[PDB]
Design an enzyme around this catalytic site. Sequence first.
Site, PDB file in Angstrom:
ATOM      1  CD  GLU A 258      -3.041  -0.874   2.052  1.00 13.19           C
ATOM      2  OE1 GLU A 258      -3.199  -0.548   2.529  1.00 13.19           O
ATOM      3  OE2 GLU A 258      -3.623  -1.982   2.206  1.00 13.19           O
TER       4      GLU A 258
ATOM      5  CG  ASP B 170      -7.004  -2.340   9.489  1.00 10.86           C
ATOM      6  OD1 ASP B 170      -7.948  -3.785  10.616  1.00 10.86           O
ATOM      7  OD2 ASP B 170      -6.562  -3.271   8.330  1.00 10.86           O
TER       8      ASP B 170
ATOM      9  CG  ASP C 158     -11.395  -4.841   7.138  1.00  7.18           C
ATOM     10  OD1 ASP C 158     -12.727  -4.941   5.719  1.00  7.18           O
ATOM     11  OD2 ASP C 158      -9.501  -4.977   7.120  1.00  7.18           O
TER      12      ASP C 158
ATOM     13  CE  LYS D  66     -11.280  -3.716   2.434  1.00  5.50           C
ATOM     14  NZ  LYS D  66     -10.059  -5.626   3.322  1.00  5.50           N
TER      15      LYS D  66
ATOM     16  CE  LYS E 289      -8.316   0.433   5.174  1.00  3.54           C
ATOM     17  NZ  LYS E 289      -8.020  -0.483   6.196  1.00  3.54           N
TER      18      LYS E 289
END
Lengths: 449, 447, 449, 447
Positions: free
Chosen positions: B202, B243, B332, B357, B408
């Site tokens: 990321e 997270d 999540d 997502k 995000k």
Amino acid sequence: PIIERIQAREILDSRGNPTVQVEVTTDYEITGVANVPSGSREALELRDKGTKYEGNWFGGKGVMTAVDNVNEKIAPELIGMSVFDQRAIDKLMIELDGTATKSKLGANAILGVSLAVARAAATELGMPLYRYIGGANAHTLPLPMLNVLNGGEHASNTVDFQEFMIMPVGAKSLREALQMANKVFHNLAKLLKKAGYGTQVGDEGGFAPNCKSHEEVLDYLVEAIKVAGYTPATSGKNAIAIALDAACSELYDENSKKYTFKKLKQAIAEKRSGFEHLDNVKLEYTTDELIEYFGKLIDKYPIISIEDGLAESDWEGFAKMTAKFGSKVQIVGDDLTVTNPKLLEKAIEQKSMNAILIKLNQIGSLSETMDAINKAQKANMACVVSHRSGETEDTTIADLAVAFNTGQIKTGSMSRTDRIAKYNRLLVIEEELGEQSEFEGSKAFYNIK
Amino acid sequence: PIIERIQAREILDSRGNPTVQVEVTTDYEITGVANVPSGEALELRDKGTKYEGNWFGGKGVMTAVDNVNEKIAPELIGMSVFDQRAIDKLMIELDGTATKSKLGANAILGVSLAVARAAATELGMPLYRYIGGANAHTLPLPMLNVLNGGEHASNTVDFQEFMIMPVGAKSLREALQMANKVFHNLAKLLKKAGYGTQVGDEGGFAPNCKSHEEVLDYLVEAIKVAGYTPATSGKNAIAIALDAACSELYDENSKKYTFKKLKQAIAEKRSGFEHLDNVKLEYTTDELIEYFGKLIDKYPIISIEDGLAESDWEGFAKMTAKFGSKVQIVGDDLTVTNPKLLEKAIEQKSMNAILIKLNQIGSLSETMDAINKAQKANMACVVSHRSGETEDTTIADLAVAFNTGQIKTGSMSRTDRIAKYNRLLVIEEELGEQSEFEGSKAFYNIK
Amino acid sequence: PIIERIQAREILDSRGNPTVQVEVTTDYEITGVANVPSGSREALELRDKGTKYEGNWFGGKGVMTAVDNVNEKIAPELIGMSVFDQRAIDKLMIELDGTATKSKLGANAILGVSLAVARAAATELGMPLYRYIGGANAHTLPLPMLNVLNGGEHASNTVDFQEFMIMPVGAKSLREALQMANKVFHNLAKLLKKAGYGTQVGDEGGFAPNCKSHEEVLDYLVEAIKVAGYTPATSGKNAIAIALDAACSELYDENSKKYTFKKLKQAIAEKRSGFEHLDNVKLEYTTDELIEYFGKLIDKYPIISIEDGLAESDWEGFAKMTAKFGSKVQIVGDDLTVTNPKLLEKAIEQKSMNAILIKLNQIGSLSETMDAINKAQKANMACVVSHRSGETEDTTIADLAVAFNTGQIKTGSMSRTDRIAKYNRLLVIEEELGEQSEFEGSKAFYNIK
Amino acid sequence: PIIERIQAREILDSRGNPTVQVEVTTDYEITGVANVPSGEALELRDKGTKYEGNWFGGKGVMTAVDNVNEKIAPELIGMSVFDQRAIDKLMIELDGTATKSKLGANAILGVSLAVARAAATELGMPLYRYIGGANAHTLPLPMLNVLNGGEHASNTVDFQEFMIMPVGAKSLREALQMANKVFHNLAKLLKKAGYGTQVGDEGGFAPNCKSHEEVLDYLVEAIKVAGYTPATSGKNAIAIALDAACSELYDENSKKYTFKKLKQAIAEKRSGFEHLDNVKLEYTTDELIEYFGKLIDKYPIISIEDGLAESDWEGFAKMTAKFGSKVQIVGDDLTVTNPKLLEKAIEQKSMNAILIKLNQIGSLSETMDAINKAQKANMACVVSHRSGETEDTTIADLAVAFNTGQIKTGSMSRTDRIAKYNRLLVIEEELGEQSEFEGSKAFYNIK
């Protein structure tokens, strides 16, 4: 076809630093968008240090000065011109700037416009960009050289050469070339992890593990090729070859005329923990000793190409290296020629090399880039179309390599979309050409005597 | 407006693994192209098929590609590209399974998104306006994953993402400037300390720090050296989001959460880990909630994602009750963009935000339904990237379409992340004075 | 997309009083037409009293001043703008007026233009207005609350609360909801006629029979529901619930802080003929006693929603009522919030209510209305999109309720085309969506804790 | 111009009962939409069918809707939308019955009007110009039903409609201003007298007045208080029109007309009806004609509709002979927009005006024929609403198309009436100085 609007804006590149995007809109309401990549006779990119924009971004690396130059200086001169007159538009910008290195307007202002115009033209015609640039016989996919192991400055290991690349010469299509490179890359990650090394990545998507020497790095590439099921070799069925960027300008001392493996030397001087079995390795090289070192590596490893094996001022050394090895090995100029027309003419005259890296933003316009490719190819040199360290989602260099059937591209390892986006564009081009496409592995090297 | 051709093909994602691209062409020779990310609906790969040998690990998606070209496309040719909900329903029913395991979630989402992009382009309308209507105008506050730990990192940092959130920004452009200055100053601090600054999937760093607190201390120091204030609101404020990814730390039989990587380093008496023999490594649900309370008191933490395990519903409700009036609590793994799990979280007050997502549910219409439902329940929708991304920037338009207030989509490097920020910059410019950026007022979910 | 002409004119509303119509024409010769409805922090509608136009119509209720403001002041500022930039057009008008309540140009001038622009944009795109306003997932038909029995000021009966509505919560489509409401409405007419009461209608198409009390009115609604074949209940198969607008600002005394059932009290004071069995009914209520009265009604009748149960200044009372009943009953602000952004922010902060009535012309622009709906929905409030007493053949509020999937609409009884035209538009929307549509009865109340 | 699609659907009218809407789409993707009103050709409803339970009273029209979609539409696809007369003839013959009882008058009229609206829109031409040609330019004088009695009203006023007609107006806009001022002053007078001011189907009041004369006295008083003169011509003049609806009062065996509701109130000795025992309640034809003569002498009555029963042809001819040189005599129930009954009325001089109701004959072409024939016979054509109306405004364009000079479309409230007045306002604005409004000269039929 008439240019009706030109708009530049500031975006970000893959290293997190600002760069230029330009959008050109025609009187048919068709738009072309292009971005400028970013990495000393080369064309000058203009940044915001020393202007009221310096504080916008880290290090004063904003490009709003260049953006303003597009919107306030270049655009009013081009509105009304035909988007199809690429050479006339580039000439107008070159003359408006009036300096050899594009230092008044900025090479990044000029190239952004130059590329956005060409993309707008191709879209207005409904033609693929590679056909617009290269004509009806633009059809050859390039063999990629992929920078999967890294050293040099910027790397904390003691590997002094910069780029250690694989080149899947045995592939029969670009798609197969990427499959081969995918299998080698992920097996290399697995070998490094098993050895205790890290597998985070650098700017171009490859690994800089804490290897101690050039030979250790090359040994990993050979092992990853074998474990992936392929053969380390410069030609033949299932062959994968190695390409180097030694970046030897970084290792040279102009006064002693010696090249030094600097980081390894420092580690040995400090008597660092794992560096005693390398106590009598040679660390300082004349030009002839370094050429001898490359000859030993060529004997031992399937090296098919060496970029910047000598320093940018070592013209005599380059021509000696090309005379000695150029009937078997590609010799590429990067820092030697910096995509500069006059340095390319000298390299042709002196037989300094048999290939050149092509960096659009080092020369600053598409027309000048096309002139350089035309001239190099007619001189039996290969044109390796290249990325920069700072890339974007723009994929122009994929179309540029197909446009001139160059046969080779250098646009990164098998990770990061700043690299992978070019490979995806090449996959789409190959699909669209269908049986009209060609791919040469070994036979791409028409420049090897 | 009539769909004339649908073509899927195999491309590569930002981790070097295959994924699906779909191109939809209309009546009017307009095309939309979309790509599927990769990290609950099932992504179909090529193990066990004739295609397994194409790519490392059998990770090809040609089976999904064939499913688009041979099964889905003939059913959709002739439909109007504007009937998004009818097209998504047809694919959902053609597959006929809850997890899209017959056609593949990656086959279905690819078509779903390419249809929407074709429709927007045929109308001449920005994608965020097509998806969200005339009042799609609010740029999201980004949470950027600049320091990394967890299962995929070699350090001993057991939580997964340590993010900055530039709550003091008054525009998306200013938010990216603030994040740029923190990110590059962070790299300078890490290098001077002898840590490496290569990056993960990321675009962030996984230095060999010894504890969560050491990582948090670097974020605070980088915020300050960049000239900003570590704080959850106010001028020049930059906040922190976590997270924890605590499903990875949980043992469902003992009901304990373990800082596993640190525990192992300490056990093998790794060098530089002395004097840590008294560190607490094993937590009950209630102990871990008190540990988050300690971090919230010490650091400017504005949001915590997956602070408890995906099975610890009672724990999530306790955490949200205790901290939810000052701190965002995001599910999540708890909800995996699943309609029945979101309903359960709303009913039990498990959380006050949800990660969105697209490829976890598998179609644009179901994602729009989930966003509508969560926003009406006073939850924030944090539109999210996956670890494997592409040059596709749909999630930027999705966050603006529903005025979500938050996104995000990565650290400040790698074009798989930066392309989304560039799309947001372009959207903000296009909207001009019609745009809004809310900053600390983005958190309408925090009581 | 470019605005080429804007023309306002004076038309008539459903009460026989003037209102504004605006027509916007684009450079593609596409036109959008919108009308303004008509019913004190709310936006100011401008009428002709005190101008040379005062004598045109009864009561000085002409709107030619507002019409002139559109044609002479607003239109020259907007010609040339893109019809798609809804937020920019609304901002320009808001700033041109420059006052918080739109008192210089008139809220009716501004809203007329605002809505006509949006209708022109949607027509130019060939898109349904609900999709233009709300995007690709605009698909949910609203559960209607229908004002079939009437009291309050304007009604000569002694029924002090204002609106007694049915809500067909058991319906599974909008079409079924209207069938249920049709059967209840016509059976109610038949019950009233049999009892000796009149069945002419008020402004919103419902009956104001000479009933003596709230309980008599509610008893008729329950009986009409049963005779129609349905079940009086707040959820379940074949259920029809009741919604109230108490309009209690009209019953409150700010000095005594008491609410009074004024018309019933007066009838009892006069010792009117049928009013002796109601001699000891309670007529004066503190805030807590009125909340207790609502609790008794909630126990006895299938009441699912109560609008303006307390006065617009009784903020403490609203929050007490919402705390006590809001986990079972919708509590709607009308006069409390008058579609005003700052009062909505206060109601969210104080938990004054769990639903808001949305009146386009109380705030005066579509952009501000969209902002209010976005904010209320994110605060877990229901948005009940509302008609005004003075309506027209314009059906924008039907598309607005679907655009934001609001789940609820309040647009009149089952008679008069000023109401029925909205229901017909909802029938057409449901048909066009087909299986893409949704309708929630009971589950529409996502705001009930 | 080619009809590509015809779609009927079920909508609701202004009384809350179902009616037909039809949408016609051409070659060029142009659509016309029309609705059918409801109050001689037969309107088809759903009693006795599978659809009977859908709506109160079995009043659904899905049978008619199916007849459009399944029987009419296949016969018309491919015809030119401009051949109005050929399309209407095809539907008339497909049905094959005199009263359109097989397909339904509501099925046929819906298609007839939607075709005409589609044609006008495809040409870019106003509907009144498409129907009536280049000289369609005259706005009608409205007669507005502000006070109400008759069969559907609870008062004892036995005649049905008491209308104002603002003959002194010089434009349609001024006519509506005059009517607005009378209507709202009337409401104020009625409220002050203790009468109610809720409204009936047509937007007017049915107060509990005791006699026709009391109702007429309120109209005169409202005209005067509004500032106007009660008169059949002249500046500032407002006149009165009646619909007696005397078929409802007639006994065909006794040949008497009875003021039935008043008679009953007086008989039951209802309170407030004392001193009325000598009022005349029962009239022969000749006596009732003398009673109208009394009203004509006392009040500014310019028109009387259905002063005698639909079977009393001899009576109508006597009334027209006696009063027709000063007063308009309109047939409604007498002729029900029927071609053979209009012919009979012309031949016998039964009347000098006719009410025109599109859905009583069932097609636009037959209505145009009837208007052509009546105007050539020196009769006025009063284009009329029905009690059940919709947002459709066709009758406004029809009155301008044939320069009829008169319309009857409701009181000054309810959008089912006001929508027609708004359409007339728009037509007058569009015509500008090309428009005409004739006022007292509208009555070219009054000898």
